RNA sequence: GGCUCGUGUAGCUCAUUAGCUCCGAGCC
């Protein structure tokens, strides 16, 4: 998954 | 805890778009 900050991204698994 | 999400009524940032901590939630 990927919390895809507002803006940045960030991966956390799938 | 195993699986999935959310930036997250979680935040910080470096930099990396990431990487630091955690959750909270849903299912079995």
Known sequence: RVRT???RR???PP
Do not use: F, Q, T
């Open 10 to 12: 960030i991966r956390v």
């Open 5 to 7: 900050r507002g803006k």
